[PDB]
Amino acid sequence: ADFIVSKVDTVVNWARAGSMWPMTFGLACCAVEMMHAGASRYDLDRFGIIFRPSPRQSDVMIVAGTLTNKMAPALRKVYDQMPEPKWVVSMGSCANGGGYYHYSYSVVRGCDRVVPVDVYVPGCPPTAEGLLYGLLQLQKKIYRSKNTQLWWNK
Amino acid sequence: STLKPFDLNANNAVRNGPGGRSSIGGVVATVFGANGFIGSYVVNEISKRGNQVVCPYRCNENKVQPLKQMGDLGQVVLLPEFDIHDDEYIRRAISRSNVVINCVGIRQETKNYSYKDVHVDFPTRLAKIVAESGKVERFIQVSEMGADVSHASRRLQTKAVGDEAIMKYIPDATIIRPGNVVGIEDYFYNNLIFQLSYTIVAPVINNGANKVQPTYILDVADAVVKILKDKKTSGKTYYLGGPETLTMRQIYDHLIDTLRLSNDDTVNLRYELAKMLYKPLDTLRTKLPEFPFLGFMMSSDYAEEQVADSVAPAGSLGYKDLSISPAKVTEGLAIEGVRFIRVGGYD
Amino acid sequence: FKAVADVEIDFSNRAVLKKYVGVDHLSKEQGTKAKFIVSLNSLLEAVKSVPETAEYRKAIEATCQYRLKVCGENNSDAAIEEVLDAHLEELIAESKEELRILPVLLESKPWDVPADYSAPVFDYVDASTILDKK
Amino acid sequence: SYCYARKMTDKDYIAYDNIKNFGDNYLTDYIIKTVPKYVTMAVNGPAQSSVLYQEPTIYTTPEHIYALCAFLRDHVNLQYKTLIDITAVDYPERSARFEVVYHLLSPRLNNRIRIKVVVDEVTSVPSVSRIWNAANWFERETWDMFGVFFSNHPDLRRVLTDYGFTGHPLRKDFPLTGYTEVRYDYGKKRVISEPLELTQEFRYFDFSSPWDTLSR
Amino acid sequence: RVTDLLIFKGREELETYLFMYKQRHHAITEYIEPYQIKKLLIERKSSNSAFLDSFYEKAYPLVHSKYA
Amino acid sequence: GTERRPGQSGAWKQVDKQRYSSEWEQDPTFKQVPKNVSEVLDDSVSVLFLTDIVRGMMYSASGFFDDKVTILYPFEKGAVSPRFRGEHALRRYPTGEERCISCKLCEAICPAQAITIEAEEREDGSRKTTRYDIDMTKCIYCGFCQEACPVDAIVEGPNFEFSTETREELLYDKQKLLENGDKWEQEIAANLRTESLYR
Amino acid sequence: MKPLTPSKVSNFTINFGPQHPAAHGVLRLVLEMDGEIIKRADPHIGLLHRGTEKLLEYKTYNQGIPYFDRLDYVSMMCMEHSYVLAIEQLLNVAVPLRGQYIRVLFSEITRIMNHILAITCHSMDVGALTPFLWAFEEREKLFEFYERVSGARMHAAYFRVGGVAQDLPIGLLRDIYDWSRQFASRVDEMEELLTGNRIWKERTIDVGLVTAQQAWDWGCSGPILRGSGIDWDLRKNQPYDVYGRMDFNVPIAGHGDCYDRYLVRVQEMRESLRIIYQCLNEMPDGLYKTPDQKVSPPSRGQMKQSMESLIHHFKLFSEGYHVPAGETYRAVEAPKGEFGVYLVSRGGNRPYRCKIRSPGYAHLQMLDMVAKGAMLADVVTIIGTLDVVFGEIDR
Amino acid sequence: ATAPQDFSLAMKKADEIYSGKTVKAGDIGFSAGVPLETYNRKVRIFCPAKAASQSGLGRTLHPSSKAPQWKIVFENLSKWENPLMGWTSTADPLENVGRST
Amino acid sequence: PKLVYDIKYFARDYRRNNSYTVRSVDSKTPFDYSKVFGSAPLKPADVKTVRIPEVMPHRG
Ligand SMILES: NC(=O)C1=CN([C@@H]2O[C@H](COP(=O)(O)OP(=O)(O)OC[C@H]3O[C@@H](n4cnc5c(N)ncnc54)[C@H](OP(=O)(O)O)[C@@H]3O)[C@@H](O)[C@H]2O)C=CC1
Ligand code: SF4
Ligand code: SF4
Ligand code: SF4
C-alpha cells in the first residue's frame, strides 16, 4: 500500500508539473520578455507551459511588472478566482521587491505583500532563460510534494 | 487609544517601532497547528504586529501558502516536517520561542491517529518539553467550551484530559475555550450549508434543542492578543462564548432564511437512532483513511455533543474580562460569507 | 514624400495629388485663385473694426497686401502655392481662421495699453560665440 | 497651417529663409507689439527645436491666457495649431508657487513657443480646452499632480493617482514615499491601506560642494 | 477660495463612489468598518492622565501607533 | 493589394456613403469599374473563389517545411556576450585578498539604492568592509556599480540562473557575494580581459 | 401646433477590463453604448503610475537615465535619447561624430523593433497569429545586437550625456549588415500575408478615421499625422543628430484609417532600413564620447594612471556634473510619435523638474473621438493603431 | 554680490512681477490634502553652518552664494534596525523632505 | 588628439561661459514690417531655402 500510494503521488506530480496553465498578469516591462520566452525561439509549449486567458482554468500565476496601489486589489481578486493549487511566480525586480520604483507613493514593495509567492525570478528584466530556470524550479517544487502519501498517513 | 505592550519579560528592550508589520515586537511564537482554521488567524494577529512566528506544519506547501504573506521578511518561519511523536523536532521548534500556542486537534479519528494520541499524548509531551526549557513565558491552549471529563463524546473528553495535564505541568498556562467559531474557512457554517444544499436530507439531532454560543473568528484572535498583552491572565481558563446564545434550531432556521431555501430540508433524526446508525461507522473510520464523503457530522461523537448544551458556565471568565465586545454572528460582516451564496435577489 | 499605395498614380496631375493627401477633408471647395482673393479682401474688410492705429490691424493689413501682391505677379494658381508654401485650400481656410478670433480680440482689446508700457525681454548669449572669437 | 504634403520631390529645405527669420529674431517683438496687454515679460533662450536656434518664452497672467492662446492659434503669421503639453513647476520660495507652462508648435513656422502663467494655490487658471482639445487631459493631470484648479474645465478629475488620493504628489512639500501603504490582510479578506513603515529608509546623499558656483 | 477647493474635492470623493470608480471593499474598509469598530469598542477609563499613558506607551508621541 | 473595394469597409457610415454616393470613383486608391465583360468575370471569380486567401495559404504552408528556429533551453543555451550583466559577485586578488577598498562609490552611484556598505580599519590596517549587502529584489542590473568601482572589486557575473524560492535568499551579503566571485572567477577574469581592450 | 419628436436613451455602461489581445499593458475602459454602438469612451489610467517624475527629482542626472529606458519598454533608445539631448543642451556639450552615428543607428534599430511589435500585435488582436511568431525571430536578432553593445537585451542604458557608454564591439557592423540583407525579404513575407488579405482589409479599412485638423487639434504625432496626409517628421523638420545627412523619404497616406497607418508603419520600417545602411557605410572612426571629462567619465586606464582623471572619476561617480540653471524642452521622433522632456535646472546636480511628454497620452485622449460609432470589436483595432504603452502613458 | 547675470535674472524678475494672494494662516494646509497630523510636527528654520573640513563659502550665507540656503527641517523621530538585515527602519514620512527640497 | 599635452579648460569651457542680456520693449515704437515682407519672395524664382543642418556641433 505504501508503494502504491507513492506511485499514485508521483503520477499526480508528473501530471500537475508537466501541464502548467499559467495566467500572465502582464503589467509592465517583464511581460514582453515573457512574450519572447513563449515565442518561436523558446518553445514553452514543448515544456507543456501554455498560457490560459482566464483565472479559473489557470493553476500558476506570473506577476511580471510594477504593482501599484491602484492595481493591488485587482491582483488579489484575480488570485482569489483561481482554483486551489494556485502557485504564484514573482518575476522582475518590480514584482519581487518594488525594485527601481521602491521608494514611491504609488508602488507596492513586492507582490508578496498582496499574494503569497512560491518562486522569485530576479532581473530587470529577467532573461528568458532565467524565467525558464524559475519555471523549472517551480516544477521541482511540485515534484517534491507528495500529497497522496501524506493523505494515507494523515 | 494607547498601544499596550506585550507583557513579556525584557520586551521593553527589544520592542521598537509603531507596532506594525515592519516594526519589532519582542514575541517569538511557535504556533502548532498554524495551517488550521484557528491557527492561521492567531498567526496573522501575532505576525501583523511585527513579531516572529514559527509555524511547524506537516508537509503541505499549498496549505501553508497563506502564512507566507502574513509577515515581513524572516518573520514567518515554516518548518517542513512536523510530527507529534518527535521530541527533538519539538525542542528545535520552540528553541527561540518565548510564547507557545497549541491549536492541534482532530475533528475525526483515523487509522494513524486517534483522539487519545492527539488530544492527550501530544499535550503532555509538549508540556514537558516546554517546562524543561524555561525560556517560554506564556502558554496558551485552545479547547472547546463543551469539553468535560464526564462527557459522552470521546473528543470533548480527551480534550479536557489533555487540558488538565497541561495545567499540571505548566501551572501558568491559559486555556482558551471558544465556542463554535464562525469564519470564512470555518467548519460550522460551511458544514451546515453543505448539509442543507448538497445532501439528500439534513439530519438534525433531536429537534435542535441543544443551545450553543457561536463566536466570530476575529473575536477569538483578538482575545488571544489580549491574553498575551496581560500577564494577569496566566493560569486562567476563558470561556469565549458569543454575545447571543442560540439553539441549533434557530441557527438552522436563520441559515434557511438567509439562503432563501425553498422550504425546510431539515429532518428529525432523534437521538438513540444516530447512536445506532453511526456506531459501526466509527469503527469503520478507525480502520480507514480520511475520506471526504463521510466525516464529522456522521459520527456518534457529534450526536453525543449535540444532545448537550455547550454554553459557558455562569461563574466563568469571558470576553468581558478581556474588555472585548463580541460581534454578533447572525448579522453584519460575520454573515456575509453565507450571504454571498443567495439572498433571493441573487441568482 | 513617398506614397504608400502599390497602385500607380500620377502625382504631377495636381488633382490626384490633392485627392491622395486628403485636402478634400479640409474643404470640399476647389479653392481657386479668385476664392483666395475674395477671402483676403473679406479679411481686410473684417479687420476694419480694429482701431486704425493698432499694431494688430497694421500686421493684418501688411500680410493681406503681401499675399494680394503674390497673387498679382503669379498668374498660375500653382505658382501661388509654391511661393506661399501651401495649398490654395488651406490658404483660404487661413483667412477664415483669422476671422474667428476677431470677436475674442474685440472683447478684451489687447492693443489698449498705457503710453508707458514696457515689456522686459531677456536674451540668451551663447558661449560658443565669445570663445571662438570676438 | 496644416503641413499637408505638397511637394513630391526636392523638399530638402528645412523651411524658407523668410519664415525662419520671422521667428528667429522678430517673433518676440512681433508678439509684444501686436498683443501688448497679454504679455508681461519675455525670455529668449536655448531652443526647444534645436540646439543652435532660439525660441521665445512669454509670461502672461491667468486672466489673459485664453485670449492669448486664441490669438496664438489663429493669427495668420503665428499659427500654433498644436498644444504639446501643459505643465506646472512648484517653487515654494515664491509667494506665487506654481508656474503653469504651455508648450506649442507651429507647423507652418516650424517653431516652438512656451507660455507661462504664474499662480498660487488658491487662484485658478481658465481652461483652454476650447482652443486645443488636447488640453483636457493635460489640465486634469496638472490638477492631480500639483493641485492647480482649472476653471470651466468640462470635468476636472484626477487621472494618475489612486482612487481616494487627496494629496498632490509633485508638490515639493509632499514626501517622496508618501504617507500610506497598501497591504492585504488575512483577517479581513481585503486589500487595505495603512500608515507608512519602511524596512529601509530612503538615504539622501548630500553631494553639494561649498566651492560650486553654478547653483542659483 | 479654500472652501471652494475643499467642496470640489469632497464632490470628487462622492463621485468616486457614485460612478463605481471605487469598489465595495473600499467603502467597507474606509467608512463602515471603522464606525462599527468604534461602536463595538469597550475601553477601561484610564485613571492615568493623558501624559502618563503616552509616556508609558512610547518615547515619541508624534509617531503613530498601529492596531491600538 | 492596397486597392480597396467599395463594398469592403469596417465602418457603417462609410459603407453607407459609398453605397449611395459615387465619390469613391473619384478617389485614386479605390478600384474602378471593370468597364469590360472580361474584367467583370475577373473580379467575380476573384471575390467568389477566395483567390487572395489561397495566395496567403501557400505562403503560410511554406512555414510547415522550412527549418524550425528553436532552442532546447536546458540542453542548448542562447548566445551570451561578455558584456552581459547578471548576478553580482565580489572579487579577490590572486593572492586571496579581497579587491574591495570601501570607497563607497558604488553605493553612491546606485540608482536603486540596492547597496548598503559600512567599513572599518582592519587589524593589519587595511580599509575593508564589515558589511556589503545587495538587495537583488531592488537591483535593476544597470551595471553602474561595476562602472564606478576603481579596483574592479564588484562585477556583474555571467550567471542568470539564480532564481530562489524565498525572498530572503535574494538579499545577498558580503559572504555570499564573495562566494559567487569565487565560483565564477575564471569566467569573470576572461570576460574582463576581453573587455579591457574596449574600456 | 406641430407635433414634437422624442428621442432615444443610451445605457449599458460596460467596464472593459485588462484584456490580453490589445495594446500591451493594463487598460480599464468604461464604455457607454447605445445598443452595439459606442457613445462615450472614458479610459481609466494610473494603473501603472509609478511616480517616475517625482523620483527623478531625488536622483542625479546620470542616475535617472534608466528611468527613461523603463518609461517605454518597447522603444528604450528613443526614450533615453530625448533626456540625454536635453541635458546636453543645458550643459552645452558637443557630441563626437561617431557617437552621433551610433545614436542614429540604434534609434533606427529600436524604431524597427517597435514597428514589428506594433504591426504583429495588432494582427494578433485581429486574430492572425502567424506574423507574430514569424516576427519574434527578427526581434530576437535585434535584441542580440543590444545585448552585444550593452549587456542588457532590453534596458541597455547605452546612451549617455556626450556620447555612448561603450564603443561598438568588433564584428558588430558585419552582423547588423547581414541582418539588413535579409530584413527586406522578411518584411516582404509579412507584408504579403497581411496586405491584400480580404478579412484584414474589411477589418481595418475606414476604422479609426482621423483628419489632419483633428490630429493637430488633439496633439497627435508620428504615424497618426503621416497616415492622414501630413508631411511632418521631426527627423527632417527639426533634425537633432546626423539625421540631417541621412537620405530617406517620408511615407504619406491620406485616408487616416487604420489600414493607412499600417501601410505607413511598414514603409517606415523600410526607410529605417535605408537609414541603417547609410549609417553602416558612413560610420566614422574616432571618439565615441565627448572628450570633456568634467561631464563624461574618464577611461579606466586613464583614471588608473592620472591623478586628475581619478579626481574626475570620483566626483562624477559620487556627486555628478552640475547643470547650469535653465530650462529646455527637447523632443525626438519616437516610433510612437513625438517624445519630449521638459527639464528645469536650478544649477544643482539633480533635476528640479523633469516633465515627460507622452506621445501616447494624447492618443489615448483622442480615443474617445476616434471610437465613436464603432463596435466592441473595433475598439481593439483602434487601440492597436494608437499603439499605446501604459507605462509610457502613466509615468 | 554684484549680479549672476544669467537665468537667475529672469527668475528674480518673474518673482518681482508676480505675487500671491493673502490667505488666513493654515487654510492652505487643508487644501493640501495631507494628513492633518503632519502640521502637529514642529519646524526649525535655520541656515547650515560651514563644514569645518572645507574652507569654501558657498554653503554659508555669503555674498558669493546665490543659492537658497534656509531649510525647513522637522524634528527627528524613532529609528530602529531591521531584525533580518540590520537596515535602518523608520516610520517618519517627513524624514528627508525638508532637508532635501 | 591635440589635448594630450596641451591642457587649457578655460579656453574650452562652454558650460560656465553663458550669460543673459536684458532689453526693454515698448508698444510705442512701431514694428518693422519692411524686414518681414521686403525679403519675402514675390515669385517662385525668388524663393530661397534653408538647408537642413547635416551634423550637430562637435569639437573636431
Ligand atoms: N469550530 C472550531 O473551529 C473550534 C475549534 N476549536 C479547537 O481548536 C482546535 C483547532 O481548531 P481548527 O483549526 O478548527 O481545527 P483544524 O483541524 O482546522 O486545525 C487543525 C490543525 O491541527 C493540525 N493537526 C491535526 N492533527 C495533527 C497531527 N496528528 N499531527 C500534526 N498536526 C496535526 C492540522 O494540520 P493538517 O492540516 O496537516 O491536519 C491543522 O493545522 C481544535 O482542537 C478544535 O477543537 C475550539 C472551538 C471551536
Ligand atoms: S523589473 Fe524592470 S523590466 Fe521588469 S517591469 Fe520592472 S522596470 Fe520593467
Ligand atoms: S547594477 Fe545598478 S542597481 Fe544593481 S547594484 Fe549595481 S549600481 Fe545598483
Ligand atoms: S565594490 Fe568597488 S566601488 Fe564598491 S565599495 Fe568596494 S571598491 Fe568601492
Side-chain angles (χ1 to χ4, degrees), chain F residues 90 99-107 115 117 129 132 145 148-155:
Chain F
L90 278 169
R99 303 182 149 246
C100 200
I101 62 171
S102 178
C103 65
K104 285 157 184 255
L105 294 174
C106 65
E107 173 193 41
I115 315 179
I117 308 164
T129 69
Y132 192 107
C145 64
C149 183
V151 288
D152 288 287
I154 187 72
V155 293

CSV table of all heavy atoms in Angstrom, one decimal, chain F residues 90 99-107 115 117 129 132 145 148-155, ligand 4:
chain,number,residue,atom,x,y,z
F,90,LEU,N,31.5,39.7,-5.6
F,90,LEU,CA,32.7,40.4,-5.2
F,90,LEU,C,33.9,39.6,-5.5
F,90,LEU,O,33.9,38.3,-5.4
F,90,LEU,CB,32.6,40.6,-3.6
F,90,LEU,CG,31.8,41.8,-3.2
F,90,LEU,CD1,31.6,41.7,-1.7
F,90,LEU,CD2,32.5,43.1,-3.5
F,99,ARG,N,39.5,42.6,-3.3
F,99,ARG,CA,39.8,43.8,-4.0
F,99,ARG,C,39.1,45.0,-3.4
F,99,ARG,O,39.6,46.1,-3.6
F,99,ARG,CB,39.4,43.7,-5.5
F,99,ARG,CG,40.1,42.5,-6.2
F,99,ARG,CD,39.7,42.5,-7.7
F,99,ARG,NE,40.7,41.9,-8.5
F,99,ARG,CZ,41.4,42.6,-9.4
F,99,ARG,NH1,41.2,43.9,-9.6
F,99,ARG,NH2,42.4,41.9,-10.1
F,100,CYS,N,38.0,44.8,-2.7
F,100,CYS,CA,37.3,46.0,-2.2
F,100,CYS,C,38.1,46.8,-1.2
F,100,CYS,O,38.7,46.2,-0.3
F,100,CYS,CB,36.0,45.5,-1.5
F,100,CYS,SG,34.7,46.7,-1.3
F,101,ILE,N,38.0,48.1,-1.4
F,101,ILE,CA,38.7,49.1,-0.5
F,101,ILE,C,37.7,50.1,0.1
F,101,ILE,O,38.1,51.1,0.6
F,101,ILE,CB,39.8,49.8,-1.3
F,101,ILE,CG1,39.1,50.6,-2.5
F,101,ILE,CG2,40.8,48.9,-1.8
F,101,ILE,CD1,40.0,51.5,-3.2
F,102,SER,N,36.4,49.7,0.0
F,102,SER,CA,35.4,50.5,0.7
F,102,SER,C,35.4,52.0,0.3
F,102,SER,O,35.2,52.9,1.2
F,102,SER,CB,35.4,50.3,2.2
F,102,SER,OG,34.4,51.1,2.8
F,103,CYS,N,35.6,52.3,-1.0
F,103,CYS,CA,35.5,53.7,-1.4
F,103,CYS,C,34.0,54.2,-1.3
F,103,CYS,O,33.8,55.4,-1.2
F,103,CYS,CB,36.0,53.8,-2.8
F,103,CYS,SG,35.1,52.9,-4.1
F,104,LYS,N,33.1,53.2,-1.4
F,104,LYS,CA,31.7,53.5,-1.3
F,104,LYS,C,31.1,54.3,-2.5
F,104,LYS,O,30.0,54.8,-2.4
F,104,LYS,CB,31.3,54.2,0.0
F,104,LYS,CG,31.3,53.4,1.2
F,104,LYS,CD,31.5,54.2,2.5
F,104,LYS,CE,31.6,53.3,3.7
F,104,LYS,NZ,30.4,53.3,4.5
F,105,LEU,N,31.9,54.3,-3.6
F,105,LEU,CA,31.3,55.0,-4.8
F,105,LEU,C,30.2,54.2,-5.4
F,105,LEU,O,29.2,54.7,-5.9
F,105,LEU,CB,32.4,55.2,-5.9
F,105,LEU,CG,33.5,56.1,-5.5
F,105,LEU,CD1,34.6,56.1,-6.6
F,105,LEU,CD2,33.0,57.5,-5.3
F,106,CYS,N,30.3,52.8,-5.4
F,106,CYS,CA,29.2,52.0,-6.0
F,106,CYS,C,27.9,52.2,-5.2
F,106,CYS,O,26.8,52.1,-5.8
F,106,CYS,CB,29.6,50.5,-5.9
F,106,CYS,SG,29.8,49.9,-4.3
F,107,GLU,N,28.0,52.5,-3.9
F,107,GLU,CA,26.7,52.8,-3.2
F,107,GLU,C,26.2,54.1,-3.5
F,107,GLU,O,25.0,54.4,-3.4
F,107,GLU,CB,27.0,52.6,-1.7
F,107,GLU,CG,25.9,53.0,-0.8
F,107,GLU,CD,26.3,53.1,0.7
F,107,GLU,OE1,27.5,53.6,0.9
F,107,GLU,OE2,25.6,52.7,1.6
F,115,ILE,N,22.6,48.9,-2.6
F,115,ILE,CA,23.9,48.6,-1.9
F,115,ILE,C,24.0,49.3,-0.6
F,115,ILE,O,23.8,50.5,-0.6
F,115,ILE,CB,25.1,48.9,-2.8
F,115,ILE,CG1,24.9,48.4,-4.2
F,115,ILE,CG2,26.3,48.3,-2.2
F,115,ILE,CD1,26.0,48.7,-5.1
F,117,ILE,N,26.7,49.7,2.5
F,117,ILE,CA,28.1,49.4,2.9
F,117,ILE,C,28.5,50.1,4.2
F,117,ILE,O,28.1,51.3,4.3
F,117,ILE,CB,29.1,49.9,1.7
F,117,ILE,CG1,28.7,49.3,0.4
F,117,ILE,CG2,30.5,49.5,2.1
F,117,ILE,CD1,29.3,50.0,-0.8
F,129,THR,N,35.6,46.4,4.3
F,129,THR,CA,34.2,46.5,4.7
F,129,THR,C,33.8,45.5,5.7
F,129,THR,O,34.1,44.3,5.6
F,129,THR,CB,33.3,46.3,3.5
F,129,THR,OG1,33.3,45.0,3.0
F,129,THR,CG2,33.7,47.3,2.3
F,132,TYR,N,28.7,44.4,3.3
F,132,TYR,CA,28.5,44.7,1.9
F,132,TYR,C,27.3,43.8,1.5
F,132,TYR,O,27.5,42.7,1.1
F,132,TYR,CB,29.7,44.5,1.1
F,132,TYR,CG,29.6,45.1,-0.3
F,132,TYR,CD1,30.3,46.2,-0.7
F,132,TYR,CD2,28.8,44.5,-1.3
F,132,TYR,CE1,30.2,46.7,-2.0
F,132,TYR,CE2,28.7,45.0,-2.6
F,132,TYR,CZ,29.4,46.1,-2.9
F,132,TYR,OH,29.3,46.7,-4.1
F,145,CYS,N,27.3,50.2,-10.8
F,145,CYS,CA,28.3,49.9,-9.8
F,145,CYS,C,29.6,49.3,-10.3
F,145,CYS,O,30.6,49.5,-9.7
F,145,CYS,CB,27.6,49.0,-8.7
F,145,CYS,SG,27.1,47.4,-9.4
F,148,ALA,N,31.6,52.2,-11.6
F,148,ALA,CA,32.1,53.2,-10.7
F,148,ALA,C,33.3,52.6,-9.8
F,148,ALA,O,34.1,53.4,-9.3
F,148,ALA,CB,31.0,53.7,-9.7
F,149,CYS,N,33.4,51.3,-9.7
F,149,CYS,CA,34.4,50.7,-8.9
F,149,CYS,C,35.8,51.0,-9.5
F,149,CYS,O,36.0,50.6,-10.6
F,149,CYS,CB,34.1,49.2,-8.7
F,149,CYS,SG,35.3,48.4,-7.5
F,150,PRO,N,36.7,51.6,-8.7
F,150,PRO,CA,38.0,51.9,-9.3
F,150,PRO,C,39.0,50.7,-9.2
F,150,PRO,O,40.0,50.8,-9.8
F,150,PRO,CB,38.5,53.0,-8.4
F,150,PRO,CG,37.9,52.7,-7.0
F,150,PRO,CD,36.6,52.1,-7.3
F,151,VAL,N,38.6,49.6,-8.5
F,151,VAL,CA,39.5,48.5,-8.3
F,151,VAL,C,39.0,47.2,-8.9
F,151,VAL,O,39.5,46.1,-8.6
F,151,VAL,CB,39.9,48.3,-6.9
F,151,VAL,CG1,40.9,49.4,-6.4
F,151,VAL,CG2,38.7,48.3,-6.0
F,152,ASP,N,37.8,47.3,-9.6
F,152,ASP,CA,37.2,46.1,-10.2
F,152,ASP,C,36.7,45.1,-9.2
F,152,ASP,O,36.6,43.9,-9.4
F,152,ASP,CB,38.1,45.4,-11.2
F,152,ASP,CG,38.2,46.2,-12.5
F,152,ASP,OD1,37.3,46.3,-13.3
F,152,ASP,OD2,39.3,46.8,-12.7
F,153,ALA,N,36.4,45.6,-7.9
F,153,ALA,CA,36.0,44.7,-6.9
F,153,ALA,C,34.6,44.1,-7.2
F,153,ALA,O,34.4,42.9,-7.0
F,153,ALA,CB,36.0,45.4,-5.5
F,154,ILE,N,33.7,44.9,-7.6
F,154,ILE,CA,32.3,44.5,-7.8
F,154,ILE,C,32.1,44.3,-9.3
F,154,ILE,O,32.4,45.3,-10.1
F,154,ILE,CB,31.3,45.5,-7.2
F,154,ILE,CG1,29.9,44.9,-7.3
F,154,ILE,CG2,31.4,46.8,-7.8
F,154,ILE,CD1,29.6,43.7,-6.4
F,155,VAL,N,31.6,43.2,-9.7
F,155,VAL,CA,31.3,42.9,-11.1
F,155,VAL,C,30.0,42.2,-11.2
F,155,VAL,O,29.6,41.5,-10.3
F,155,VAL,CB,32.4,42.1,-11.8
F,155,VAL,CG1,33.7,42.9,-11.9
F,155,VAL,CG2,32.7,40.8,-11.1
J,4,SF4,S1,32.9,47.4,-4.6
J,4,SF4,FE1,34.3,48.9,-5.6
J,4,SF4,S2,33.1,50.8,-5.6
J,4,SF4,FE2,32.0,49.4,-4.1
J,4,SF4,S3,32.9,50.0,-2.1
J,4,SF4,FE3,34.2,48.3,-2.9
J,4,SF4,S4,35.9,49.3,-4.0
J,4,SF4,FE4,34.3,50.9,-3.7
